[PDB]
Homo-oligomer: A and B are copies of this chain.
Amino acid sequence: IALLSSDADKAVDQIIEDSKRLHIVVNGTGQAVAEDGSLLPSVRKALIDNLYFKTPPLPWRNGVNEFNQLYSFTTWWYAPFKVFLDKTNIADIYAPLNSPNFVGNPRVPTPAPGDNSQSIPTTGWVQSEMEGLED
């Protein structure tokens, strides 16, 4: 009666292997293989291969052989020059995509004539659009 179970095993076994991969990844040691054949490093291994900077910064000279050693000037710097630790926020200068309040002179690329969509119209596009109905 409940012998639909003849389909349940193809999922039960599969979740068994998935749990096995979960265990090896979380509790592994300084890997796991997915069905796609790609590797997943365990946390205790992922902590090793990630980017670590050398902690003591060096004085600046505008002289240049490592991407992983910091330099100090007056702020921290490194050569991928690019600064690493300034003292300014980002949220104060970069508009959030949600409910922004732009100031000054925002610009966009003027859309094609006659577009009726959610794109943004330009002042010099609507003004062109007005004359068509005027005639």
Contact = CB atoms under 8 A, between A and B. Distances in A.
Interface string A97-128: 11111111111111100011111111111111
Interface string A20-50: 1111011101000011101011011011011
A114 to B, nearest CB: 8
A49 B47 CA distance: 10
Contacts of A38: 29, 65-67
Contact of A95 (B14, B51, B95): B95
Nearest to A90: B91
A131 to B, nearest CB: 9
29 contacts: A4-B9, A4-B12, A11-B16, A12-B19, A18-B27, A22-B26, A29-B38, A40-B47, A41-B47, A46-B51, A47-B50, A49-B53, A49-B54, A50-B52, A50-B87, A51-B70, A53-B82, A82-B86, A83-B88, A92-B97, A93-B97, A93-B98, A94-B96, A97-B102, A103-B109, A106-B119, A107-B119, A109-B118, A126-B129
